[PDB]
Design an enzyme around this catalytic site. Structure first.
Site, PDB file in Angstrom:
ATOM      1  N   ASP A   1       0.818  -1.206   0.000  1.00 18.01           N
ATOM      2  CA  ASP A   1       0.000   0.000   0.000  1.00 18.01           C
ATOM      3  C   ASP A   1       0.854   1.258   0.000  1.00 18.01           C
ATOM      4  O   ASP A   1       1.638   1.473   0.927  1.00 18.01           O
ATOM      5  CB  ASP A   1      -0.937  -0.038   1.232  1.00 18.01           C
ATOM      6  CG  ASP A   1      -1.898   1.121   1.422  1.00 18.01           C
ATOM      7  OD1 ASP A   1      -2.256   1.766   0.422  1.00 18.01           O
ATOM      8  OD2 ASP A   1      -2.346   1.336   2.569  1.00 18.01           O
TER       9      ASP A   1
ATOM     10  N   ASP B   1      -3.145   5.371  -4.347  1.00 15.33           N
ATOM     11  CA  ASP B   1      -3.142   4.279  -3.370  1.00 15.33           C
ATOM     12  C   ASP B   1      -3.139   2.917  -4.066  1.00 15.33           C
ATOM     13  O   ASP B   1      -4.107   2.568  -4.744  1.00 15.33           O
ATOM     14  CB  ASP B   1      -4.332   4.432  -2.403  1.00 15.33           C
ATOM     15  CG  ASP B   1      -4.280   3.540  -1.174  1.00 15.33           C
ATOM     16  OD1 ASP B   1      -4.506   2.322  -1.315  1.00 15.33           O
ATOM     17  OD2 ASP B   1      -4.110   4.073  -0.058  1.00 15.33           O
TER      18      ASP B   1
END
Ligand SMILES: *[C@@H]1O[C@H](CO)[C@@H](O)[C@H](O)[C@H]1NC(C)=O
Lengths: 335, 38
Positions: free
Chosen positions: A38, A221
């Site tokens: 992430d 993201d």
């Protein structure tokens, strides 16, 4: 997580839609884990063998047992990821972590508290945060900064590539592969240092620029899969798209699926178009069955928000290079 | 140094798993709760 106040307290920790995991090895001998890479977070966390709360979810995953590692060195500092209900809590530990051949000495979170729900249904064990120290809970050195100090990489950059179909994809460490993209890289400077967030001048639907005029922020993201953006913006975009709310996702009739317009993201002065085939799951073509777009709402509060969030579906079409050295995000047309 | 790669392997997402199990999305709790993501 919810906690408004600070930069390391408002982190998009999605994972609801995440089809890709990577593998890490912690300790001596290495203890492997399936982890989500992430770019939205900056902490490394894995379920701990010290997790014992019956209704937690550590039970359904691989645990890190510090006792089985000779290279383990304890810290003990508590870290907490607060949600409306409840929490992702643990303590800080140090051990040898190996990512794609690169071995580092990492400050990671030994998770002793995981929520109900949604973690039981997560096929991955933990999270590896690809962000900057500014988003790291407890100001701990993120994985990438530690890799940088080893002087193993050609460039202090990492790039994400999502495959033609389904291994499924890959993260290039120390550069960006020319067999992944076509044409040239367009480099967009970061808004602020400490977050993979860039300036967006507008979002267009069809002909036809409708929303995000007078500027707006857009996160990149990798943990996410869909395109996020404030309720008011997604409410406008979806009403223009001819879609209706079906709870957590927006739907269209599977027959009118490919007939839909094109979404365009004005980033760094360039046209980042996304056609119907890119943002719609075309499993069916029947006028009775419903097809999921998504693109969903997601309201991020300050300092991080209000912001848009470009997930795995954007990176699928646009090969993204994350330059930590030059504090910029480079986009190239994937192939 | 030669190009280090992290191979991303395909896994079923939480949403996909819920659909396969036949979990009713409305029956996950109220708006405040908040099936963890932000
Ligand atoms: C844990 O590490 C931090 C540095 O991030 C340091 O301030 C603290 O004293 C350490 N504690 C122990 C018990 O090693």
């Amino acid at each position: 997580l919810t906690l408004g106040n600070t930069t390391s307290s408002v982190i998009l920790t999605n994972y609801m839609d995440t089809q890709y995991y990577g593998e890490i090895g912690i300790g001596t001998p290495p203890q492997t884990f399936k982890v989500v890479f992430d770019t939205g977070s900056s902490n490394v966390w894995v379920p701990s063998s010290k997790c014992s709360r019956l209704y937690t979810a550590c039970v359904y995953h691989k645990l890190f047992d510090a006792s089985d590692s000779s290279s383990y060195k304890h810290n003990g500092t508590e870290l907490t990821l607060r949600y409306s209900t409840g929490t992702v809590s643990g303590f800080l530990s140090q051990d040898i972590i190996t990512v794609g051949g690169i071995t580092v000495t990492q400050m990671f979170g030994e998770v002793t508290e995981m929520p109900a729900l949604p973690f039981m249904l997560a096929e991955f064990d933990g999270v590896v945060g690809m962000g900057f120290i500014e988003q790291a809970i407890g100001r701990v050195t993120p994985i990438f900064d530690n890799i940088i100090s080893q002087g193993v990489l050609k460039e202090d950059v990492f790039s994400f590539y999502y495959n033609r179909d389904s291994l499924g994809g890959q993260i290039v460490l120390g550069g960006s592969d020319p067999q992944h993209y076509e044409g040239n890289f367009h480099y967009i400077n970061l808004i602020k240092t400490g977050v993979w967030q860039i300036q967006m001048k507008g979002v267009s639907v069809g002909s036809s620029t409708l929303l995000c005029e007078d500027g707006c922020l857009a996160l990149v993201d990798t943990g996410a899969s869909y395109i996020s953006g404030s309720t008011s913006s997604i409410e406008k975009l979806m009403e223009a798209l001819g879609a209706k709310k079906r709870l957590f996702d927006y739907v269209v009739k599977c027959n009118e699926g490919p007939t839909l317009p094109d979404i365009s993201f004005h980033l760094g002065g360039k046209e980042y178009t996304l056609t119907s085939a890119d943002y719609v799951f075309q499993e069916s073509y029947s006028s009775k069955k419903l097809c999921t777009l998504a693109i969903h709402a997601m309201d991020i509060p300050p300092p991080t928000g209000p912001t848009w969030a470009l997930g795995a579906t954007f990176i699928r079409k646009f090969y993204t290079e994350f330059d930590r050295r030059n504090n910029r995000i480079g986009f190239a047309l994937a192939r | 140094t030669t190009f280090k790669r992290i191979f991303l392997k395909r896994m079923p997402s939480i949403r996909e798993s819920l659909k396969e199990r036949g979990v009713d999305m409305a029956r996950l709790g109220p708006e405040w709760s908040q099936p963890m993501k932000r």
